[PDB]
């Protein structure tokens, strides 16, 4: 039960207003580094690591 459930995800999608026709904010790298930091720059996921990370929900 490590993978996120689809039904819940859809609830999140609708509860966050993501089903509404809007523009997608273009977030800068710098803003994400501040509000969503990683231990260090060596931990930037690449390649298949990206898909694998979206499967899990630790």
């Amino acid at each position: 039960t490590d993978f996120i459930d689809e039904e819940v995800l859809m609830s999140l999608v609708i509860e966050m207003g993501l089903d509404r026709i809007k523009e997608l904010p273009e977030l800068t790298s710098y803003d994400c580094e501040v509000n969503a930091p990683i231990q260090g720059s060596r931990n930037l996921l690449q390649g298949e690591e990206l898909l694998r990370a979206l499967d899990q929900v630790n």
């Binding site: 996120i4 689809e6 819940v8 995800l9 859809m10 609830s11 999140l12 999608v13 966050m16 207003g17 993501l18 089903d19 509404r20 026709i21 809007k22 997608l24 904010p25 273009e26 977030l27 800068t28 790298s29 803003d31 994400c32 580094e33 501040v34 509000n35 969503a36 930091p37 990683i38 231990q39 931990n43 930037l44 996921l45 690449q46 390649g47 298949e48 690591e49 990206l50 898909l51 990370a53 979206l54 499967d55 899990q56 929900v57 630790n58």
Partner: protein, 97 residues
């Protein structure tokens, strides 16, 4: 440490994260199913292509394609964040029925 964290920026991050999670599952659904589904959620196509570009993108942070660098940073936080009190992840990781 650095600048102060913006609650507005945090919300946009978890919105993009939720969209990325959807797109991935929206694609894995077609990767096992086989047939090409016509998803109607706004920007799903965009983030699907972002994901596909990012899996073989080599420019890292410097990249120009919109949402590539931000998505890499966000998904990287998603994986490495273990904290139970994280303001970005808590509504997502602790979502449930």
């Amino acid at each position: 440490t650095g600048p102060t964290a913006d609650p507005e920026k945090r919300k946009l991050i978890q919105q993009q994260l939720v969209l990325l999670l959807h797109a991935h599952k929206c694609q894995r659904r077609e990767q096992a199913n086989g047939e090409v589904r016509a998803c109607s959620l706004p920007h799903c196509r965009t983030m699907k292509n972002v994901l596909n570009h990012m899996t073989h993108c080599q420019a890292g942070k410097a990249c120009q394609v919109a949402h590539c660098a931000s998505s890499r940073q966000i998904i990287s936080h998603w994986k490495n964040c273990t904290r139970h009190d994280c303001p970005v992840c808590l509504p997502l990781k602790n979502a449930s029925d």
